[PDB]
Amino acid sequence: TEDFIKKQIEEFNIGKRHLANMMGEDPETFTQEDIDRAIAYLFPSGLFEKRARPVMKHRAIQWGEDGRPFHYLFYTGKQSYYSLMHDVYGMLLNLEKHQIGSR
């Protein structure tokens, strides 16, 4: 749930502060690129697949503790796609009522 994600966020912040301390960097300006460089230096892995290398970084649930889903199209099972289709259809209705290098 969101509690686990928040706990992970706090843990990541604490670990980021420790990493900044270890590298001697300023804990304030210690950004994600600095984190990645420090991790690559401290844990040098030459695995070709970059997803398998060590990494220190920062899907969700669609209903709250009461069981009520947040999106009104949740029960479709494809709430994002159908919400997008609904918005596009509404824009088309509005347009109808009122009246290269891209792929």
């Binding site: 289709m85 596009v88 259809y89």
Partner: protein
């Protein structure tokens, strides 16, 4: 015993003998004479004739019903008015 050149007689129009022959053949086909001529070459037994006639009636009824159904449902074949919904 009838008078000649009245039954199954087609006058040629400006010499289009081929067209006149095709017209006469169409007339014979529409009147069913060709069917009788070819089916009387060999004797069709009465049971076989009854089975064939029943099958022909069933096939005609089924074809008419299918055609009527297709024509009735053809109205729905317009473009989708609720695209995206």
């Amino acid at each position: 015993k009838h008078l000649k050149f009245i039954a199954r007689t087609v006058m040629v129009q400006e010499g289009n003998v081929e067209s006149a022959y095709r017209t006469l053949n169409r007339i014979l086909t529409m009147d069913g004479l060709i069917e009788d001529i070819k089916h009387r070459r060999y004797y069709e037994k009465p049971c076989r004739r009854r089975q064939r006639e029943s099958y022909e009636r069933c096939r005609r009824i089924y074809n008419m019903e299918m055609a009527r159904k297709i024509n009735f449902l053809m109205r729905k074949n317009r473009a989708d008015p609720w695209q995206g919904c």
